[PDB]
């Protein structure tokens, strides 16, 4: 339930003369992707032991 | 507005002795900006650079 959601946009398009935007857009998008993998995974691995120990 | 005051509008004369600051406070609908109409080139960059001075 804590996964608050909102309208999101896709990676936009750029012409060949504005490549700096494309890499900046990739860096921010990849940064969030890397964050959520480790954050989400380590949550269900740490909290799987919590429930197993609880039982 | 920043452009109106930087260009030296006849109004906005009460804020000449306010040289040093930390940031700039505007009005939600700044009216007395630039009198002669036109297109102020590189407006946004000017605001960022003038956002902080000593």
């Amino acid at each position: 339930e804590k996964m608050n959601t909102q309208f999101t946009a896709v990676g936009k398009e750029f012409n060949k003369l504005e490549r700096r935007m494309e890499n900046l857009n990739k860096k921010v998008d990849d940064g969030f992707l890397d964050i959520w993998t480790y954050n989400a995974e380590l949550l269900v691995l740490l909290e799987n032991e919590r429930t197993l120990d609880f039982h | 507005s920043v452009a109106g005051w930087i260009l030296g509008n006849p109004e906005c004369e009460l804020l000449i002795s306010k040289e040093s600051w930390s940031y700039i406070v505007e009005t939600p609908n700044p009216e007395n900006g630039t009198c002669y109409p036109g297109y102020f080139a590189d407006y946004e960059e000017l605001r960022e650079q003038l956002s902080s001075v000593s």
């Binding site: 309208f7 999101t8 946009a9 896709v10 | 109409p37 297109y39």
Partner: protein
Amino acid sequence: SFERFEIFPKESSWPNHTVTGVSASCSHNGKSSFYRNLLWLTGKNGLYPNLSKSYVNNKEKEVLVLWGVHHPPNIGNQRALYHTENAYVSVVSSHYSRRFTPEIAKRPKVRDQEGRINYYWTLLEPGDTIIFEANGNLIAPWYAFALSRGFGSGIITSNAPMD
């Protein structure tokens, strides 16, 4: 909303310019045609009177207008369809203005055609005005687009079946 509405009627707004301009690069069903929202303007009786039209956005919503400028590949063609050597167009608005000029030069063949049309677009506001002034090489608008942008969205590219 995307109301595609006539803005410059071809039958009354250009009494002094020929409007049936066709291109072999945009053939449709085996015969030459042109765009269905723009209008290639040419001369008439060997004369090309400079044009000056205006529009006021009477509607209560934003309108989107397109237009283009044609660059002939050789000076002979330029003088043929416009009877001038140094043309100029201008498109003014309340807070928007530009002055395009044609550029003539030999270019590599693309789709069996050398000349180039540079398309441009803008937006208006309720009650705003847009004035077209030109003396040649103006591809005037023929259909505008009234739009109702709502909190943005995204564009998807795919090939999935429609359902």
